[PDB]
Design a protein around this ligand. Structure first.
Ligand code: HEM
Ligand code: HEM
Ligand code: HEM
Ligand code: HEM
Lengths: 146, 141, 141, 146
């Protein structure tokens, strides 16, 4: 993917401060609260009845960590997002049957979480660099759909 | 908001569809699955092969729902209540997908109603499908 | 539909914005212009540089409209009538863009209300902005 | 833009039957009728008060002819849409200020017009091929936006 030097450094710098475990759990939990239809993929996760239930669910926190960890790996291969996520792209299509629109929603919620967490450090230009990345990632994951 | 003219347009076009509604519903689905493959993610339990009974039956139910909506174009929320509950609480289809099926229904109608698919009717049908979609997505959150 | 808890959440959060509403409207536009460059096509007549007073001025108008919407949450269509007329008949901003500003407003709120921007509040605000967006685009066709 | 040979052929074959000027006027007029906000660029075209006024406007027809002629020429370059539409992309961004969402709307109206024109010959597979092309063209025209 195509990032300017300033955009890459913006992304990389902020990411060094992210606790993947914590942000992952927040991002996934918020997705399930804000866009509840997304809960259709997590019927076996337990109680998702209220925001407090969603946010405190250990399975949500666990999954969230898994997802952001894979996300982190892609940050290391910004030049070839498609090659990086090919396997997971196929998995999400063929075995999980996840509508790629969900990748887009998660991307937006993540941006919200970063802004919530970092405050004033998450400036307009930093956000813009993250929007590019998140879109890039979502596109990489939807790539093998058929 | 559907204007009185819109309602007239819709009732006229749908009237023409008549007895083919179910076959048209099936065709719209096949067009969607082929054009927008991500929509297939909601039908992993179906045989999506061309002419499958599952697709023909589903096409029929979709068409019937649409007929119901045309019949009750002044009271859609109430007419589709049960369907809005099903989509919001059980199916949970992302709202984006309604725009894709609506487009494919429009294409299907265009391909079968040469005489009736005028610019004004096209506009009215588009609005109508947008309204149906809004009602079906209304209870999502 | 905005539940009583949604309305409470919105009034609480917007209450906290208070006098900073204008500053936050400007920041949201700035976020929008950098993140989604296509939105700049509607402001060819503005200086979109960081700090621009044009953006600042526009930011205040947007924010003021949102305050009016919050004050009239049970009666939005009427309170925003002139603005829905304006967008539909003169500005003619593609409906897609409303979702982009909405997201940017949410990001701005998150960055400024750490304590208030709870998952529950986030959800209510998103619903609220979608309702405002719906109203503003109500008379497009 | 990757099309199987089958898809490329389905496209080329139907296009040979198209009256470019006629389809151009029809598609542009229908865009203006179905999504009236798109009229924002055409106030110099005169009367757009009604569907009939739109469909019959000579300026609309002439613009439709210009737009579809470029589209038509692009069909010869399915392999390099981005290169083919680069200058036009820049013009649409820098000088005309056209929101790329308009290209998507036109693409969908164009598909409806072909369907209306060709009836049963516009099969599900033929539509699918044209959907890819219309999306490809819209993406190529939005590519140089900044
Ligand atoms: C940021 C984009 C995403 C990435 C990088 C990602 C990555 C992953 C990974 C690494 C796994 C585990 C693979 C394994 O079992 O070997 C997984 C599983 C899964 N993902 Fe995704 N994911 C993403 C977004 C999503 C979204 C948005 C949803 C739906 C809302 C989703 C639904 C699932 C489900 C249902 C599973 C299976 C978990 C289980 O077995 O219970 N993913 N994902
Ligand atoms: C105009 C828009 C739509 C209408 C009127 C509609 C209507 C219906 C109806 C009448 C049923 C059957 C209910 C029953 O069995 O009692 C149904 C089920 C279903 N619909 Fe919706 N639908 C629409 C859009 C969509 C979209 C866009 C999708 C996904 C892309 C979708 C996915 C489903 C699924 C997966 C089922 C379950 C069917 C089964 O398992 O047999 N629908 N819909
Ligand atoms: C929450 C959603 C929005 C609200 C509440 C809103 C509100 C307003 C207000 C209050 C004005 C000033 C009207 C006047 O001058 O009397 C305005 C104008 C304008 N808005 Fe909207 N707006 C929204 C979304 C958008 C979006 C998404 C765009 C395009 C990306 C847009 C483009 C414009 C433009 C171009 C003007 C005219 C600006 C000028 O020439 O000064 N608006 N809007
Ligand atoms: C497939 C999509 C399109 C193609 C291939 C295309 C192509 C063109 C071409 C070849 C021109 C003339 C360039 C020149 O003056 O050298 C043009 C101009 C223009 N286009 Fe586009 N166009 C497309 C879509 C659109 C859409 C959807 C709109 C707005 C709804 C639009 C608005 C305009 C305007 C306002 C002009 C200037 C006309 C004039 O000065 O007379 N175009 N376009």
């Amino acid at each position: 993917m195509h990032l300017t030097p300033e955009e890459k450094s913006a992304v990389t710098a902020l990411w060094g401060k992210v606790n993947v475990d914590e942000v992952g759990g927040e991002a996934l939990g918020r997705l399930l609260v804000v866009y509840p239809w997304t809960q259709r993929f997590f019927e076996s996760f337990g109680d998702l009845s209220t925001p407090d239930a969603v946010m405190g669910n250990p399975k949500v926190k666990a999954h969230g960590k898994k997802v952001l960890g894979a996300f982190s790996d892609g940050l290391a291969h910004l030049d070839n997002l498609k090659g990086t996520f090919a396997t997971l792209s196929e998995l999400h299509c063929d075995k999980l049957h996840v509508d790629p629109e969900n990748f887009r929603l998660l991307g937006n919620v993540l941006v919200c979480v970063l802004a919530h967490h970092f405050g004033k450090e998450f400036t307009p230009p930093v956000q813009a660099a993250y929007q590019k990345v998140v879109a890039g990632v979502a596109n990489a994951l939807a790539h093998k759909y058929h | 908001v559907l204007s009185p003219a819109d309602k007239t347009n819709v009732k006229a076009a749908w009237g023409k569809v008549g007895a083919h509604a179910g076959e048209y519903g099936a065709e719209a689905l096949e067009r969607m699955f082929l054009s927008f493959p991500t929509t297939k993610t909601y039908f992993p339990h179906f045989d999506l092969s061309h002419g499958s009974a599952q697709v023909k039956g589903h096409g029929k139910k979709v068409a019937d729902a649409l007929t119901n909506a045309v019949a009750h174009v002044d009271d859609m929320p109430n007419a589709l209540s049960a369907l809005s509950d099903l989509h919001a609480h059980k199916l949970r289809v992302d709202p984006v997908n309604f725009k894709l099926l609506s487009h494919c229904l429009l294409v299907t109608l265009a391909a079968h109603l040469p005489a009736e698919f005028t610019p004004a009717v096209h506009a009215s049908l588009d609005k109508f499908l947008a309204s149906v979609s809004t009602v079906l997505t209304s209870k999502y959150r």
